[PDB]
Write a protein that binds this ligand. Structure first.
Ligand SMILES: [Zn+2]
Lengths: 71, 308
């Protein structure tokens, strides 16, 4: 891939997020609420799909992720 | 010939033949204990237990369940044949496992052995530790759901759930409030945050009231916004610099705008109170969902059990 292409992609990616989350990041556009937004979570983290949660598979998943997180 | 036939089956590894031979023998026999030992060596707990019980040796039938770590069968046979010495076995085995930091293994045994209270306590401790750690809300919700499920299994064994399912609901409504805030339905997000205000014992107060203040600011609820910063500043677990930051932000907000503003069961789907007397109810989590939003979900939003 072209280096200029990588630079353009990086610039667009950086430009995206600011206007993506300016809707709730600031009040009226002049007051920045970065202090209060710190307790929010990423979009994909608060997405849940309607799938049955059986005890065994859920337990295995949470155990695996805990073991990966724990050190 | 029986004695040599069992040896031929064993060396041939035709364990189905061994099982057929053991079930074709009379109630007692000099060969059944040997067959059960063979089964134990190869690892067939069920066939070994049946063979030993045919020999009328329940002590070994439970010693193999302990040895092969089939604690459900061990406890059941202890209850039947009146040994009752396996409680200490489970206690010290789980103590050793905890000494190895394998709490999940302890929970697994306690679930296998139907000691659901102990596994529920362990999962409650783990969920509380995760909540204190401030990890991802979905993970905490899953842990609390599993803990509540263990509590429900213990209660079904008996025949406090208002604590387990409440612990699940706290983080579930946290997630729902965040989702509704992102989706733009600010009014529902504010209502859900106000409803979550009741669970300050589980979720840390700082996160709760910061989210509530954010929802109020994004939804033009400045009275509730002021009521949120009052508690946020008054919180005793905040640093002096953090208190100064909160005070300065509140000062800016309330110089910009005026501070003055303009139980029934709760629907899991949208946090609004269930006004109607007739409403869809879950079969497990015991928390209702409004009749206008039941059909949308193929599983109960709180506990993900099948709808019905
Ligand atoms: Zn439910």
């Amino acid at each position: 891939p072209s280096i200029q292409i990588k630079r353009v992609m990086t610039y667009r990616d950086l430009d995206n997020d600011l206007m993506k989350y300016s809707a709730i990041q600031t009040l009226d556009g002049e007051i920045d609420l970065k202090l209060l937004t710190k307790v929010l979570a990423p979009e994909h983290e608060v997405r849940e799909d309607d799938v049955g949660w059986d005890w065994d598979h859920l337990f295995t998943e949470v155990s695996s992720e805990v073991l990966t997180e724990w050190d | 010939n029986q004695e040599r036939l069992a040896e031929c089956y064993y060396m041939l590894e035709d364990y189905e033949g061994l099982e057929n031979l053991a079930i074709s023998l009379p109630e007692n026999h000099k060969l059944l204990p040997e067959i059960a030992q063979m089964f134990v060596r190869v690892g067939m707990c069920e066939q070994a237990v049946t063979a030993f019980l045919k020999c009328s040796q329940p002590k070994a039938a439970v010693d193999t369940c302990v040895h092969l770590n089939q604690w459900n069968k061990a406890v059941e046979l202890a209850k039947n044949h009146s040994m009752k010495e396996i409680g200490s076995l489970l206690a010290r085995y789980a103590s050793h496992l905890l000494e190895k930091n394998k709490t999940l293994d302890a929970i697994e045994l306690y679930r296998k052995a139907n000691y659901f209270f102990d596994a529920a306590k362990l999962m409650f401790k783990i969920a509380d530790e995760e909540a204190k750690k401030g990890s991802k809300p979905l993970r905490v919700k899953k842990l609390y759901v599993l803990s509540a499920l263990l509590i429900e299994q213990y209660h079904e064994q008996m025949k406090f759930t208002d604590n387990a399912w409440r612990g699940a609901e706290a983080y579930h409504f946290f997630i729902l409030a965040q989702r509704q805030l992102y989706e733009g339905c600010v009014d529902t997000a504010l209502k859900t945050a106000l409803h979550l205000k009741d669970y300050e014992d589980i979720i840390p107060p700082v996160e709760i009231y910061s989210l509530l203040a954010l929802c109020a600011c994004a939804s033009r609820a400045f009275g509730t916004c002021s009521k949120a910063f009052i508690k946020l500043k008054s919180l005793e677990t905040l640093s002096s610099e953090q208190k100064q930051q909160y005070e300065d932000l509140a000062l800016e907000i309330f110089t910009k705008h005026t501070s003055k503003d303009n139980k029934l069961p709760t629907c899991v789907a949208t946090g609004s109170p269930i006004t109607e007397y007739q409403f869809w109810m879950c079969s497990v989590c015991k928390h209702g969902v409004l009749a206008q939003e039941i059909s949308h979900y193929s599983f109960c939003p709180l506990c993900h059990s099948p709808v019905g």
